[PDB]
Structure formats: structure tokens, C-alpha cells
Design an enzyme around this catalytic site. Structure first.
Site, PDB file in Angstrom:
ATOM      1  N   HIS A   1     -13.784  -3.174  -8.220  1.00 14.27           N
ATOM      2  CA  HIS A   1     -15.225  -2.855  -8.182  1.00 14.27           C
ATOM      3  C   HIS A   1     -15.419  -1.596  -9.006  1.00 14.27           C
ATOM      4  O   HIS A   1     -14.449  -0.900  -9.268  1.00 14.27           O
ATOM      5  CB  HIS A   1     -15.736  -2.737  -6.737  1.00 14.27           C
ATOM      6  CG  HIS A   1     -15.175  -1.603  -5.956  1.00 14.27           C
ATOM      7  ND1 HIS A   1     -15.670  -1.246  -4.723  1.00 14.27           N
ATOM      8  CD2 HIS A   1     -14.185  -0.755  -6.216  1.00 14.27           C
ATOM      9  CE1 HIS A   1     -14.986  -0.214  -4.264  1.00 14.27           C
ATOM     10  NE2 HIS A   1     -14.086   0.103  -5.159  1.00 14.27           N
TER      11      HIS A   1
ATOM     12  N   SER B   1      -9.891  -1.311  -5.146  1.00 12.36           N
ATOM     13  CA  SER B   1     -10.463  -0.143  -5.855  1.00 12.36           C
ATOM     14  C   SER B   1      -9.390   0.542  -6.705  1.00 12.36           C
ATOM     15  O   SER B   1      -8.832  -0.120  -7.574  1.00 12.36           O
ATOM     16  CB  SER B   1     -11.143   0.755  -4.826  1.00 12.36           C
ATOM     17  OG  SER B   1     -11.132   2.141  -5.104  1.00 12.36           O
TER      18      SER B   1
HETATM   19  C1  LIG Z   1     -13.289   1.830  -8.229  1.00 11.55           C
HETATM   20  C2  LIG Z   1     -12.046   2.701  -8.276  1.00 11.55           C
HETATM   21  C3  LIG Z   1     -11.890   3.327  -9.648  1.00 11.55           C
HETATM   22  C4  LIG Z   1     -12.095   3.765  -7.191  1.00 11.55           C
HETATM   23  C5  LIG Z   1     -13.065   3.457  -6.054  1.00 11.55           C
HETATM   24  N1  LIG Z   1     -13.917   4.604  -5.757  1.00 11.55           N
HETATM   25  C6  LIG Z   1     -14.144   5.621  -6.588  1.00 11.55           C
HETATM   26  O1  LIG Z   1     -14.331   5.485  -7.792  1.00 11.55           O
HETATM   27  C7  LIG Z   1     -14.181   7.000  -5.947  1.00 11.55           C
HETATM   28  C8  LIG Z   1     -14.705   6.893  -4.515  1.00 11.55           C
HETATM   29  C9  LIG Z   1     -14.411   8.132  -3.713  1.00 11.55           C
HETATM   30  C10 LIG Z   1     -13.221   8.255  -3.018  1.00 11.55           C
HETATM   31  C11 LIG Z   1     -12.946   9.399  -2.289  1.00 11.55           C
HETATM   32  C12 LIG Z   1     -13.856  10.429  -2.251  1.00 11.55           C
HETATM   33  C13 LIG Z   1     -15.036  10.324  -2.944  1.00 11.55           C
HETATM   34  C14 LIG Z   1     -15.315   9.180  -3.674  1.00 11.55           C
HETATM   35  N2  LIG Z   1     -14.967   7.934  -6.723  1.00 11.55           N
HETATM   36  C15 LIG Z   1     -14.514   9.159  -6.972  1.00 11.55           C
HETATM   37  O2  LIG Z   1     -13.409   9.551  -6.612  1.00 11.55           O
HETATM   38  C16 LIG Z   1     -15.438  10.076  -7.717  1.00 11.55           C
HETATM   39  C17 LIG Z   1     -15.159  11.427  -7.784  1.00 11.55           C
HETATM   40  N3  LIG Z   1     -15.946  12.281  -8.438  1.00 11.55           N
HETATM   41  C18 LIG Z   1     -17.022  11.756  -9.018  1.00 11.55           C
HETATM   42  C19 LIG Z   1     -17.294  10.410  -8.959  1.00 11.55           C
HETATM   43  N4  LIG Z   1     -16.517   9.553  -8.300  1.00 11.55           N
HETATM   44  B1  LIG Z   1     -12.303   2.939  -4.706  1.00 11.55           B
HETATM   45  O3  LIG Z   1     -11.889   4.088  -3.876  1.00 11.55           O
HETATM   46  O4  LIG Z   1     -13.236   2.181  -3.836  1.00 11.55           O
END
Ligand SMILES: CC(C)C[C@H](NC(=O)[C@H](Cc1ccccc1)NC(=O)c1cnccn1)B(O)O
Ligand SMILES: CC(C)C[C@H](NC(=O)[C@H](Cc1ccccc1)NC(=O)c1cnccn1)B(O)O
Ligand SMILES: CC(C)C[C@H](NC(=O)[C@H](Cc1ccccc1)NC(=O)c1cnccn1)B(O)O
Ligand SMILES: CC(C)C[C@H](NC(=O)[C@H](Cc1ccccc1)NC(=O)c1cnccn1)B(O)O
Ligand SMILES: CC(C)C[C@H](NC(=O)[C@H](Cc1ccccc1)NC(=O)c1cnccn1)B(O)O
Ligand SMILES: CC(C)C[C@H](NC(=O)[C@H](Cc1ccccc1)NC(=O)c1cnccn1)B(O)O
Ligand SMILES: CC(C)C[C@H](NC(=O)[C@H](Cc1ccccc1)NC(=O)c1cnccn1)B(O)O
Ligand SMILES: CC(C)C[C@H](NC(=O)[C@H](Cc1ccccc1)NC(=O)c1cnccn1)B(O)O
Ligand SMILES: CC(C)C[C@H](NC(=O)[C@H](Cc1ccccc1)NC(=O)c1cnccn1)B(O)O
EC number: 3.4.21.92
Lengths: 178, 180, 180, 180, 180, 180, 178, 178, 178
Positions: free
Chosen positions: E105, E80
Site C-alpha cells: 500500500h 507495508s
Molecule cells: C507503505 C510502506 C512504505 C510503509 C507503511 N507506512 C508508512 O509509510 C509509514 C507509517 C508510519 C509508521 C510509523 C509511524 C508513523 C507512520 N510512514 C512513515 O513512516 C512516515 C514518516 N514520516 C513522514 C511520512 N511518513 B506501512 O507501515 O503501513
């Protein structure tokens, strides 16, 4: 329910059940069953089968007063367990009609409770615990035909009885050997 | 650490609930300051809702056992065990700042102690003994009769600093010594 | 640690909820700085939602007891007990930065205090005494009548820094002294 | 500790949720660095989802009160209170790295504040005052009208670093200065 | 502490979930090592399941902002946000040890963000912007088209170290240099 | 600290569950001891129930990457990931004390990974790849075929120290060298 | 249910039960039972057997007002426990028809409650606690035929009664000795 | 159940019960009972006995609109407790037919609620809290026959009433002294 | 139960109740009640009294489609609260037969929901939230006889209505003043 239906059909046969921990809910249920059966016929005996681990003193004193002031005799039946208040209500039956089934167990012990609140509240609770203990022991003395000093010494912790030991102690009057 | 700097100036905080962990902290601090100098006054600033009776009498005896005089000053509250520890200071050296409240009440069991009535008779004779011992402790330190303490601590008697001075719990409502 | 560096410059944060642990931290810091130098001003930066009344009056009395003048500056919020501690500063030395809010309100019991009505009558006479003592404390520090404090703190009265200056809680809306 | 090494280079992280504990950490670090040197710039690296309005205005006033210029650089996010603190930097010295997002929105109560409707009328007049004060704060720092801030922060307005530069929240999208 | 010894050898662990606390630790360590020597390479050993997008772009921008080249080596997993930070290293200096997995992803919201549909339209336009920004970030660092990143990160695409080298996320599958 | 004293004698404990926090501790300790002396043997005492596959391969690659030979000695248990890390030592230098057990088994997902069947197909192709990679890793280190590892790790295969020597996981059942 | 059926059959015999903690749910149940039995026959007595640990004042005042304004007499029966509000409703019976079973226990104490909210809210609660305490003590004075000063001194903490002690104090009028 | 059976038999006697906290569940139950009794006979009065600690405004406004638009008169009965919304629905009865039992307590206070969400959401909630407060005070002004300024000053915190105080204030029209 | 019995007797009088939060459980209950009453008589009106805080769109769309495709008219009655979906189903009644009781409150706002999962999942949810919002606004435009631009501007946050304000806006057609 079926279990309410089978208890209802033996209520028609004047057989009631102290079949759980005697709290206020089933004591008022048993008191109402004794009042209802004394209203139907004041002459035929009520069979109170007791499978009880004990419970509240005043809930059992409610049953005990309803047993005595019923004009019909309350035959009590130790069925498996007559512990604490269920021991009391077993021995509270009509003399000559207190029965223990042969593998029922009878537990006589001093009452359980709790102290809480301020020291003046607890001192009142202690005075009332001494009144409840004395009345529980005097009535167990009256039931078993034994001195209150023997009741107090024996109930100091858990004293268990078989049906034969409860027969010689005085909780029951016969052991059913059909 | 301002706690350690005041401790070097022989100043102790009874600042938390009086339990056994708090009592051991006070008793260690009282016995070190006795061993450092038994002649200089220990100042015990008390901001506490009270607590357990055993930890009360652990601090109470240690305050009375050490050779140093204990200056109890109440700051904010001395409730329950802490009011007794406030009264437990050296006579003439028990203070309260003017808007500190002093709550005296009879002992109480927190929650419900279950058990057989023979066990409960002993727990009740003990909380009555804890009640009588608190009232006797407050008798010799406030100058009032223990039966007067019993009627007054029958429920919560919150005193102000002036009312605790008239009651005998403190000796002086500690005046503000600000230079301006 | 910037907390210790400001403490050496005689600057104290009332930055958390005013409870007994926070009160003991303030009172230790006030009494060390009194013992370090009783003539230099203690600065009390206040960012607090308030808290308990006993820990309020523990800090209040200690602010008034120490020989050093207490410069209370409000930063963000001085609510409840913290508004009273903001008003508890030395007159002429009570500040608030321009977007700090000052919430004054009558005392309150957190949660429900159970008990018999005789116990509740005492708890209510105490929270009324806590109400009267807060209003009397805010009377002598804001220059308003205690009945005016009672009508104003009947519910939440949030003041701005300018409105707390007109009310008498602070003395100066502290201007930004940035050089650019 | 790299936090302490950057603090000696006058670099502060607003890196957590803006609450009173975080605000007191920022204000202590801002006032120490003012007392160390009031002429050198304080750098405030902001990676924060925002938080409470009082702790916002506690940091906001302290950023504006200290004599040193505050270089706010946004890294990752400046949301809510943190976007206002990002805009609260010294003009010309407000940066955001190119993939930092800037979320501006009207204030909100976390959870439900219960109470009588007279209490709720005051809580609503306060959150409206918090809304108006945020929009007025974002007005003088972004150069836009407060009614423009009100229409834009009616819901979440996430800006990029370029969009926050055009909005006036930062002054420069901070270019990558990597040597390769 | 082996963390501090490697930090003196300009070696940083992205070893936990990429949240704001982890991001502030990385950014402080990146900006200290930039201030120590901007010419020597910073090594960023990455063993992380990823995390928040803001803390991703906080680390991402800081990796690109500092003058020192960032040697990203993946150890175990770069998933991620951590896969993007792995690709965010200096070109030619992005490694993965041979049995490290690289999970790319699309972004995701953890749990359910409640709200009105106008608020949800903004949260969805933001997570689409976060999706587009991640794919654009992975476009310039892997050399692939952003539409190719969009089709590949539509679900979980776990790469091996060799497969991440062919994809462009790393530049060299880092050979084992054990002497025996 | 006996942990630090053994670390100065180039002795590392894999003594906890192999997760990312444990893996980062091992990898920092392996890379410091590589940088201290790449010629002296690192001793890795392993008392671990195993854990995550990524943190397994993070430690696995780091054990194989560092120039120093890794002496893995099993003490008590080398289960799951820890059995693979036990087999991951330098050949001839993999020990187990005689009553240490060695549990080898196929990888597993802790709890339930929810999702659409297209996501679950990828999670299953990954845990199959994790299964194949573990068996290939145990193939080159035990000298057995990867299909033999697959039949043996189909369920839990607990080996004794002697049985892990015959299996190829260790090289020597480490004799007790007590002088009496 | 059987327990609802046995209470229904004694409702036909004009026997109702204060058999739990008097909250609003069973008070409205008891008030509806008193209204229903006064609608059936306004002359025959309602037997209210009380096995109650007490409860809400206004729930018990609902029962008390329904007991008085019923044109038929409410015979009250201390059965095991009449504490607090159940003590009150026991002593609230028709004079001459307040009965204690011989081992029932009667607990009279000042009302319990809670203070919460702001100091102006608590001051209103305190004024209303003083009104509730005075009306609970005046009615217990009217029930027992004893002064309100004796009721206030005795209810200051928990004061327990046997059936004989509740007879001489005035909660009940007879002790059932069938 | 027996408790549903006794309420059913007094529903036949046109006696309904606001016997709990007025939420949406028992308001729709009471509204359906008023509609059913107005469908049976549009002339005979409905007796609404109220033992209620208050509750939802719109649930009580549902009951209030069902009380008014019923062509038959709604006799309201303060039984123990008429607080907040139950106070409102007590005073919402037909004039001349609003009754307080003599030891019922009447609590009139401004409505309770909660603010949540964004500042624009809370500002709408505040405007609607000002509309609900004004309509609750105007209708309490219409019920009691007293000015809305007196209703607003008295409901600012909890104002408690006895049956006599609620009689002179205007919540009820008589006190039942059978 | 009694509450199921009173709803059953008004189901015989073709009076059904949207009396809670419209989830799938009571929507299928209401849809089955509309189908059952349209099977009994296709000519007599169904009275749908609505005391509802809103709820699920598709549960309310299930009720709405069952209301329209019933050959008999659905008279809707705002009773206390018609918020969100209950507002929708109120305004979804037959024109001329949409009634507000005079102190009912009508809340019209854009739909609530949640986004979760991956960004491609949320983008599909957003497209469907835009479809649900447009269909909720177009149908509220069709109900109230007002433009969809006015519905979209007014539903952007919570917009509250009295019975008179809902009359002039177009949710209801009359205010019941019996
Ligand atoms: C794909 C890459 C860019 C990051 C992946 N996840 C996200 O995009 C993360 C997943 C997450 C992690 C911690 C808390 C809440 C949400 N998404 C976000 O941080 C996020 C934050 N504000 C709005 C929309 N998405 B990874 O952590 O699986
Ligand atoms: C009958 C006696 C002798 C023995 C035991 N009974 C009690 O003492 C019971 C146990 C119990 C049951 C329910 C709730 C609380 C306590 N004790 C009481 O009821 C009790 C306790 N203290 C004062 C008044 N009553 B039995 O239940 O084991
Ligand atoms: C009245 C003074 C002497 C003390 C007050 N309370 C007590 O007496 C305390 C209250 C308390 C505190 C902590 C844990 C349990 C109980 N009572 C006791 O410590 C206690 C301990 N064992 C038996 C009986 N009482 B104070 O804490 O309110
Ligand atoms: C109004 C000023 C004086 C203080 C405000 N509140 C109080 O007065 C506080 C609120 C509070 C805080 C912590 C724990 C319990 C209660 N009241 C008290 O401390 C208190 C303590 N004992 C009796 C009565 N009130 B502030 O905290 O909102
Ligand atoms: C919009 C900017 C000014 C700040 C944003 N939120 C607020 O305004 C915050 C959100 C919050 C944070 C922590 C605890 C409770 C509430 N609002 C407040 O602090 C607040 C405090 N008292 C009354 C009204 N609002 B941010 O945190 O999303
Ligand atoms: C068999 C060896 C390789 C490792 C064993 N277990 C695994 O393979 C571990 C068990 C585990 C540990 C912590 C959290 C979640 C899952 N599997 C994984 O780490 C894992 C991670 N992502 C996808 C699939 N499996 B051991 O821990 O029992
Ligand atoms: C009847 C009196 C004298 C004694 C006791 N009754 C009360 O005081 C009861 C106990 C109770 C029951 C349910 C909910 C809350 C409180 N108190 C009240 O009902 C009460 C308390 N404060 C104000 C108004 N009513 B009994 O229940 O022990
Ligand atoms: C009737 C009024 C004057 C007094 C009180 N009623 C209310 O205000 C009730 C209390 C309550 C009940 C259930 C759920 C939430 C809130 N408040 C509401 O229903 C309410 C609150 N804000 C807006 C709209 N309605 B009563 O219940 O104490
Ligand atoms: C009818 C609309 C305009 C207003 C509100 N209704 C909704 O939007 C409801 C509220 C709700 C109820 C149950 C479960 C989840 C969500 N939302 C939905 O049903 C919903 C949300 N997103 C997509 C599809 N349906 B009402 O309930 O406040």
C-alpha cells in the site's frame, strides 16, 4: 424541571425533602426552605420527609438548628431510609411528630470522618471528633429519650432499625398506618 | 557495582525513601555486616527524605540491635525518618557533610485515613504515640528533652550540618578531606 | 558496558536529572574511586539538566569530601544543580566542551507545596536558604561575590562554554584534541 | 549481542531519539573507543529522528573531542539533531546510504514553556542562540554560509542522500557493496 | 535462545513492527553477519506488519549494502514496509511460505501531523516523495513499472504467496519440505 | 528453566495468545529443532486462545515447512488460530488431552477498522479470504469439506477432545499414562 | 431551579447564604446580593447565614468589605459550620448581630496556601503570606475583641469552637435559642 | 439562575462585575455590558467591581478599550482581589473614580505566557511579548501616573498592594470608607 | 442566562460578537444573526465586534459570505484580539467601517491544519491547503489593499499588529478614539 416543580408544589404544602446525602448544598437548601416556611406561617407544621443515607454532621447540624429555631413544628418522616445524619434529623423532629413509614429503615452509627496532616493536626481532629461524637450522642440521647451510654454502645458500628424498632428506640413517635 | 564494593567496605546507603522495601534492604545489609564482623564500624551514608514510621523504627532498632557501631553520615538531606536514623547512629560517629540539611518534624499521615471515629481515635492515638516515640528517640540521641523535641518538631525544622551538630543530631560536621 | 570501562578509567557520568537515585549513584562511584586510588583524578562528565537541591548538595559535598580531585567536564548542558556541580570541580580542572551550555538560576519548587502559612513560611525560609547556599557555593567556586550570583541567577542565565569560563564556572574551554 | 560485536569493531549506533540517555550512551561509547585506540576510525551509524539540542551538542562536542575520526553513515533518517550529528562526522568520512533521508530544520521547543515574559525572553534568546549555534555548526560542516543554513532550515528541508551530499551534510552517498 | 542459534546460522527475524528500534536490531544483525562472512547468504524471515518509512529504508539500504545476499522469506505477513523489505531481498532468493500474505500500500502518516500549511506542504511533498521512493523501490525489485506500483498500492493490495510471486515481490513460493 | 529443558527434548509450548511475538518464538523454536535434527518429532503442546490470522499462518506454514513432524497436543484449549495450529500437526500425531476444549470459529477483526468504503471493501475481501483460507486449511487437515467447515465455524463451535477427534482436528484423545 | 428560587425568596426577605466554600464565584454572588439589598433598603438588616468550610481570603475579603461598606447591618448566622473564611465572615458581622445557632461549629485557623515557582517568587509569596496572616489575625482580633497574640496562638493550627465557645471567644454575640 | 438574576438587577443599577479570571468569555460579556449601559445612558457612571485573579491581556485590552471608548465614566472597584489583568482594569478606570475597598489586594506583575513551536515562531512570540509587556507597562504608567521604568522594575515579579499601597502607587484614587 | 440576555439586547441594537474561537457552532450562530438582522432592516449597519483567537477557515468563510451577501454593511470592530480567522473577518468588513479599538491586537498568519491518512489523501489535502492558502491570501489582499505577495510573505509565520499597524496595513479603516 418537573422534579423541581413537584418539590415546589409540596413546598407550598409545607412538605420538604431530605432526599439525598446531606452535604452542605442541600442542607442550605433545606435550611432556606425551613426559614421560608417559618416566614410564611409560624404556626403550621413543616413536614420533612427523609430519604437520606446520612452525610455531613455540620450540614445536618445546620438543618437541626434550623429545625429547632423555627417557631413552627418540624414533622419528620422516615421514608425508606433515615441513615446516619438523616437518622439524626429524623429523631430531631418535634416530639410527637416524628413519624416512620412502616418499611423505612433507620441506621444509627457513630460519625465517619478522616484524619490527615501532621500528628498535631490529627490530635486536634481527634479532640474535635470526640466533641462531635459526644454531641451527636448527647442529642441522639435527647431525641430518643435513652441514655448516652446506650447511644454510644449502639452507635459503635452500624445499628439498623425497622420502623417498629425505631419506634421503641425513640427515633420516631408513631408509625403511619393510613 | 559500586554499591556492592562499598558494602564490602561496610558502607550502606540509606539513599531512597524510607519504606518497607528500603527498610528490609537496610536491615539485611546491617545483619550481614554484623555477621561478617561485629567489631568493625558500619558506615550508613544517608541521603533520604525519610518515610514511614514503621520502616523508620525497623531500621532504627536494627541499627541499635547490631553489635557493630553505625557511622551515620548525612549527605544532602536527612529528612523526617532519615533525620532520626541519622541521630540513631553510634554517639561520636554521627556525621553530616557541611551542606547536608537535616529536617526534623512530627509524624504525619500521608493522605486521608477514612473510618469511624472510634477507628480514627485509635489512628490518632497511634500517630500521637508515633509522635511521642519519635521525640523520645530523638531525646536520647540528641541529648535534648523530649518536650524540646516536641516544640522543635511541631513544624519543619530544617537544620544545616552545623545546626544539626548543635542540636545533637550529628556529632561532627564532617570536614572535606580532599588532598588539594 | 562502556559505563563500567570508563569507571575503571575513573570517569563518571552525571548524565541524568540530579535526583536522589542519581545522587546515590554518583556518591557510590565517587567513594569507590576514592577507595581505589585517592591520588588519581576522578573525571565527572556532566550532561544534566540539574534537579533537586538536596541531591545537588549530596553530590556537591561528596565531590568535595573525596580525596581525589574531581575533573568536571560539561558536555551539552550543565543546568541548575548540574551547573553548580560543574563549578564544584577541582580548581583548574573544571572544563566544558565548546558547545556545552551552562544554565545557572535560583532554586525553585517543582509544583505547588500546599500547607498552612506557618508551614509555608518555613518552606520559603528553606528555599531562601537553598537560594543563599547555592549562591554561596557558586561564590567560592566561581570567584564572584554571592550578591553577584544572586543578581545573575535571578532568572535563567545560560552561559556558553566561553561565558562560563569568564564567569568562573569552568576553568578551561576544553579544546578538541582530534588528530585530523 | 550484535550491538557489542559492532562496538568491538568500533561501530556505534545513533539509533534512537537524541535525548540525554541516548547522548550519554554515545559519549561513553565514543570515549571508550578513543581510549581503546585513538587512531582507528569510529563508525557512527545514524538512524535517528533527532532530539534535544543539549544532547545534540553533547554528542557533537564528544564526536569532535575524541582523537578518533568519526565516520557518520546515515541509514534511513538523520533528522534534526541527527542531521547535525551526521554532518558532525570527520570530513571525507560522512556517508549516507542512498535512500536515507536527511531532515534539517531550525530548533523547536516541545510543548509550551510557560512563564513570565522576562523568563520567556530568556527562553527565546536561548532558542535563538540554539538556532544560531545549529546554523553555525551546520555552516562549518557543510561549507555553506550560516545565513544559507538559516534560510534552508527555516522549515523542514528533507534531503535525500544525493541532496545531502550536494548540501554538504554527507561527503559520499555510500554505494551498495553487495557482491551479487 | 533460538534467536541466537538462528543468528549463528545467519538467520534474522524481521518479526516485529518496523520502527527504529527494530531497524537498528536488523542493521546490527546484518552488519555483524557481513563481517562474519560476506559470502554466505543471510536469511531474513519476515513476519511483520511493516512500519515507518525511514526504518524501512534503513533496513532496505542495509540489506542492499551488505556484501552477503539476503534471503527474504515471508512467514505469515509482509505488510507495508515489510512487503518492500521482502521484495528487497536478493533476486532469486526472495521466498514466501504458501499461506503468507503480502500487503502493499502507499505510505501513510499515523495520526495527524499538525502545523502551518507551509509546514504541511513540506510534509505532503515528503509523503509524496516517500510514496514515489517506495514505488521506485518496488519497481526495481518486482520488475514492474513504478506507475503500475502506484495504481496497485493506491489502496491495500493484499497478495497471497502465489500472487506475490506473479507480482514480483517474491521469487519462489517456498514449498513445504517436510519429510512425511 | 523447564521451558528450555523441554525444548532440548524437542517440546514447544504454544501457550500464549497467537500474536507476532508468539509466532516468532514458535518459528525460531521450530527452525532450530529442524536444524538440530530434522528426523525426530517436534512436540507442540498447545494451550492457547488463538489470535491473529497472520501469526496463525506464520506458525502454520512453519509447522508444515520444517522437515520434522509436528506432534500437536492440545492442553486445556486450542481456540481459534490455536485450533487450526492443533489441526496443523502431522497426521496421526495430533493429540488432545481428554478435557481440552477445541474452539473453531470464523476469523474476526478485533475492534473497528475505520476507513473509506473502498478501503473497507478490501478489508472485507481480506477477512473473507482469511475466512476461506482458514476453512481450506481446516479442510485438508480435518478431512471435511471446506463448506462443512464454513457452516460449523459460522459461530463458535467448541469441541471436546473426543468431539475434535471425530471432527478431524486431532487424531487421538491422548490417554492418561499415569502409572498408578 | 427550586434551590435558586428558595434563595431568591429569602433574598426578598434580605436573607443571604454563605453556604459553600467561599471561592470567587459565590463571593461575587454574595457581594452582589449585599449591594442589591443595600440598594433596596439601606436600613433593614441583611441576614447572612453561614454554612461554610472556609475558602479564599481575598474572596472573603471581598465579602467582608462589601459587608462593612454596606450602610445596613449584616447580621451573621453560624449555621452548622463557620470555618476559616466562613468563621471570618461570621465574626465580620455587625457587633450585637453576630449569631451562632447552638450546634454550629466555628473553626478558626491561620490561612492555607501554596508556594510555587522560583525562590524569589516564593519569598514574595512569603512576604504576602505574612501580610495576609497579619491582616487576617488583626481583623479577627478586631472582631472577637481579643489580642492579636491570642488570635495568632489560637489560629496556629485548627481551633474548633462550639456556639458557646465562639460566644465567649467573640466570634458571635448571641446564641439563638427560639 | 439567581446569580444571573442578581447580576442582572445590578446591571440595571449600572454595576457590572469583573468577578473571575478575565478570559475571552467574560470579557466579551463585560464589553457587551459596557456597550449596553452606554447605549442606555451615556452620562451615568458604570461601576465595575473587580474581584479578579487576572487573565488574558487581549481579553483585558478588550475590556479596557470598551471602558475608554464608552462615553460614560467607568468607576472601578477593587473588591478583594485585583490581580494582573484585573489590576490593569482597576487602574484603567476613570481618574478620580478608581476605588479600592479597604481590604482588597492589588497584584501588579509582568504578563505571563508561553513559548511554543519552532525558533522562528518563538522569536515572533518574543517580539510580541516585548510589545505586550511594553504596552502593559506604558498603560500602567499612564494609569498610576508613575514612570514606565518604575512599572517595569516593580512588575518584574509579583508585587502585591494593599488598598493603601495601591492608593499611593496610583492604581486607585480613593479608598471607600462608608 | 444573563450573558445570553446581554448579547440579545445588543442583537436588538444590531451589535453581534465574534467573541470566541470561530468554530462551526458560533459561525452558524453569527451567520444566523447576520441573516436575522438583514431580515429586520436591510439598511442599518451590523456591528460585528471581534474578540477572536481565530479558528476554522470554512467557519470563517461562512461568516465572510454571510457578511458580504447581507445587503446591509457589516461594521467590524477589533476588540482586544483579531487573530487568524478573526483577523480575516475583521478585514472582511465593509470598507470605511472596519474599526480597531486602540489596544486591540491583530494577528495575520497562514492557515493551520493537519495532514493525515494515506499519501494520496495527504496529496489531496495539500492541494486543498494550497487552494485555501491562496484564497485566504487573495481575500486578505483584497481586504488590506496590498499585494498577495506581501500577504504571503507576511503571513508565513505569525505577524502581529497593533491597531495603528493594522490601520496602515489595511485590516481596519479607522481607530476608535471616542
Ligand atoms: C507503505 C510502506 C512504505 C510503509 C507503511 N507506512 C508508512 O509509510 C509509514 C507509517 C508510519 C509508521 C510509523 C509511524 C508513523 C507512520 N510512514 C512513515 O513512516 C512516515 C514518516 N514520516 C513522514 C511520512 N511518513 B506501512 O507501515 O503501513
Ligand atoms: C451523622 C453521623 C453520626 C454518621 C455519618 N456522618 C458523618 O460522620 C459524616 C460523614 C461525612 C459526610 C460528608 C463529608 C465527610 C464525611 N462526617 C462528617 O461530616 C465529619 C467527619 N469528621 C469531622 C466532622 N464532620 B453518616 O453520613 O453516615
Ligand atoms: C517524622 C518522621 C518520624 C517520619 C515522617 N512521616 C511519618 O511519620 C510517616 C509518613 C508516612 C510515610 C509513608 C506512608 C505513610 C505515611 N507516618 C507513618 O508512616 C505512619 C504510619 N502509620 C500511622 C501513622 N503514621 B517523614 O516521612 O516525613
Ligand atoms: C538551582 C539549582 C540549585 C537547582 C534547581 N532547582 C532546585 O533548586 C530544586 C528543584 C526541584 C527538583 C526536584 C524536585 C523538586 C524541586 N529545588 C529543590 O530540590 C527543593 C527541595 N526542597 C525545597 C526546595 N527546593 B535545578 O533543578 O533547576
Ligand atoms: C533542530 C535540531 C538542532 C534539534 C531539533 N529540536 C530541538 O532543537 C530541540 C527539540 C526538543 C527535543 C527534546 C525535548 C525538548 C525539545 N530543542 C531543545 O532541545 C531545546 C531545549 N531547551 C531549549 C530550547 N530547545 B530536533 O529534535 O527536531
Ligand atoms: C479464527 C482464527 C483463524 C483466528 C481468530 N481470529 C482471527 O482471525 C484474527 C483476530 C485478531 C487477532 C488479533 C488482532 C486482530 C484480530 N483476525 C486477524 O488476525 C485479522 C487480521 N487482519 C485482518 C483480518 N483479521 B482467533 O484469534 O479468535
Ligand atoms: C481564611 C483563612 C484564615 C483559612 C483558610 N483560607 C485560606 O487560607 C485560603 C484557602 C484557599 C482557598 C482557595 C484557593 C486557595 C486557598 N487561602 C487563600 O485564599 C490564599 C492563600 N495564599 C495566598 C492568598 N490567598 B480557609 O479556607 O480554611
Ligand atoms: C495582565 C498581565 C500583566 C498579567 C497576567 N496576564 C497575562 O500575562 C496573561 C495570562 C494568560 C491568560 C490566559 C491565557 C494565557 C495566559 N497572558 C496572556 O493572555 C498572553 C500571554 N502571552 C501573549 C499574549 N497574551 B495575569 O493574568 O496574571
Ligand atoms: C484563518 C487562518 C489563516 C489561520 C488559522 N485558521 C486555520 O487555519 C484553521 C485552524 C483550525 C480551526 C479549527 C479546526 C481545525 C483547524 N484551519 C482550518 O480550519 C483548516 C485547516 N486545514 C484545512 C481546512 N481548514 B487561525 O485559527 O489561527
Amino acid at each position: 424541571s418537573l422534579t423541581d416543580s413537584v418539590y415546589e408544589r409540596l413546598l407550598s404544602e409545607r412538605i420538604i425533602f431530605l432526599g439525598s446525602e446531606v452535604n452542605d448544598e442541600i442542607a442550605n437548601r433545606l435550611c432556606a426552605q425551613i426559614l421560608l416556611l417559618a416566614a410564611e406561617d409560624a404556626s403550621k407544621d413543616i413536614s420533612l420527609y427523609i430519604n437520606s443515607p446520612g452525610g455531613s454532621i455540620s450540614a445536618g447540624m445546620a438543618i437541626y438548628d434550623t429545625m429547632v429555631l423555627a417557631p413552627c413544628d418540624i414533622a419528620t418522616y422516615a421514608m425508606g431510609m433515615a441513615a446516619s445524619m438523616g437518622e439524626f434529623l429524623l429523631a430531631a423532629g418535634t416530639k410527637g411528630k416524628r413519624y416512620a413509614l412502616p418499611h423505612a429503615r433507620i441506621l444509627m452509627h457513630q460519625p465517619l470522618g478522616g484524619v490527615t496532616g501532621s500528628a498535631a493536626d490529627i490530635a486536634i481532629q481527634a479532640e474535635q471528633f470526640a466533641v462531635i461524637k459526644k454531641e451527636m450522642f448527647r442529642l441522639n440521647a435527647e431525641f430518643t429519650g435513652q441514655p448516652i451510654e446506650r447511644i454510644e454502645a449502639d452507635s459503635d458500628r452500624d445499628r439498623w432499625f425497622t420502623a417498629a424498632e425505631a419506634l421503641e428506640y425513640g427515633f420516631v413517635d408513631h408509625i403511619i398506618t393510613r | 557495582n559500586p554499591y556492592n564494593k562499598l558494602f564490602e567496605e561496610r558502607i550502606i546507603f540509606l539513599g531512597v525513601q524510607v519504606d518497607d522495601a528500603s527498610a528490609n534492604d537496610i536491615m539485611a545489609q546491617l545483619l550481614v555486616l554484623e555477621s561478617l564482623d561485629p567489631d568493625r564500624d558500619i558506615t550508613m551514608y544517608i541521603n533520604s527524605p525519610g518515610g514511614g514510621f514503621t520502616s523508620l523504627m525497623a531500621i532504627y532498632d536494627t541499627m541499635q540491635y547490631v553489635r557493630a557501631d553505625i557511622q551515620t553520615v548525612c549527605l544532602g538531606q536527612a529528612a523526617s525518618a532519615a533525620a532520626v536514623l541519622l541521630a540513631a547512629g553510634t554517639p561520636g560517629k554521627r556525621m553530616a557533610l557541611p551542606n547536608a540539611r537535616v529536617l526534623i518534624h512530627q509524624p504525619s499521615l500521608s493522605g486521608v485515613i477514612q473510618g469511624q471515629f472510634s477507628d480514627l481515635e485509635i489512628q490518632a492515638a497511634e500517630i500521637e504515640r508515633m509522635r511521642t516515640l519519635m521525640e523520645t528517640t530523638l531525646a536520647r540521641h540528641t541529648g535534648k528533652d523530649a518536650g524540646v523535641i516536641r516544640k522543635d518538631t511541631d513544624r519543619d525544622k530544617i537544620l544545616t550540618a552545623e545546626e544539626a551538630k548543635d542540636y545533637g543530631i550529628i556529632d561532627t560536621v564532617l570536614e572535606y578531606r580532599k588532598l588539594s
